[PDB]
């Protein structure tokens, strides 16, 4: 539909470009925000499942939590490929729209305790599709902006997008105590304290908003007429660990924190507070990116990783052993530090990756001869392709962290096994980051 698109031309940006770009960003954001809601749905639902009569083991509950990152991580690169094929307009609507399927489904499944575990697996995997909308959403919205304004534009899209996790964790525990949707078949379950739990509401609540913004994408967003070899580059694989330790930890803690808290402090209503982790984690991401812009992303990343390690070590002192020899207040504080520090890490790592990967490619093609034009060109495309692939690999952390808790608990009755692996991982990361700093990035 839009065949003349010249965002770098000031006149064009004034008469038509900015208006168009602005409308597309402000439909993009709520669409992405909702996807993140759906992606992490089981982080609030699985804790409430035994409260409605389900008898799944602890590991099974963590698994339901973990799996949507597997399918999300898998579809991220296919999803980025989709937006040039079907256009940003129809694909945003569609990638938003289909999420009504798991939402609606989970609602009924949750009211029937004869629903097999297998059915929840399937739903869990379907929610994961929402994890892939990022790759697609981000790819798309960059085309609507000139180079000078893309950082701001992508920052806001991804930024507010990641907010979806904490807004879902915020309202899901609240709507779950109301008897709305009675006429759609919601049924309450009386709890020990005398109140009533409407678990269907946790997912059903997003259906009206999903539908509203599917429409908004279809009629409101526009289409604009305007990779393999990068896997061989070893630096991509090194960088992918860093993002996975940061972004993967943001998501992974988002998925597993509430379930873990219940296993460690069974008498705390953690869903009253859990949303605050992903909240500050999402805000930290943008702060991480801003600090990297001014200070250098590897420097920020390195310090952050050191904090990540320290804070993951402190977490052991907060735990009960075995009866109740622990402290929930310290446990929470520390996790907020880990949430914050993971989010910050997301942003510093992401910024660092694109910087390091641009200069590596620039220097390489210059070294074999080639115009500055061809140098900038191949630096552009390769980093774009590198960043997509990293962002896919990173999401795997969202599976590994809660799944590790689950296996740790099932095999030892303690989470200490899972936390030992995390600590080691962070330690290796500060070493890896120290390395690139000494090897590439100290000279900037
Ligand atoms: C002219 C072509 C018209 C094509 C219509 C496209 C409809 C898409 C949005 C509604 C999708 C379902 C939203 C409501 C689900 C509930
Ligand atoms: Zn190197």
Author numbering: 14 to 239, 247 to 464
Paper quotes:
In this work, we demonstrate that NarK is a nitrate/nitrite antiporter, using an in vitro reconstituted system. The overall structures of NarK in both the occluded and inward-open states adopt a canonical MFS-fold with 12 TM helices, with TM1–TM6 and TM7–TM12 forming the N and C bundles, respectively. The substrate-binding site is located at the interface between the N and C bundles, in the middle of the TM segment.
In the nitrate-bound, inward-open structure, a triangular electron-density peak of a nitrate ion was also observed in the substrate-binding site. However, we found several differences in the recognition manner of the substrate nitrate, as compared with that in the occluded state. In Site B, the distance between the nitrate ion and the Y263 phenol group is increased from 2.4 to 3.9 Å, and only one oxygen atom is within hydrogen-bonding distance with the Y263 phenol group. These changes in Sites A and B increase the volume of the substrate-binding site in the inward-open state structure (37.6 and 50.5 Å3 for the occluded and inward-open structures, respectively). Taken together, the overall structural change in the transition from the nitrate-bound occluded to the inward-open state, including the bending of TM7, TM10 and TM11, induces the movement of Y263 and R305 in Site B, which enlarges the volume of the substrate-binding site. This change in the substrate-binding site may result in decreased substrate affinity in the inward-open state, thereby facilitating substrate release towards the cytoplasmic side. In contrast to their conformations in the present occluded structure of NarK, in the inward-open structure, TM7, TM10 and TM11 in the C bundle are bent at the conserved Gly residues.
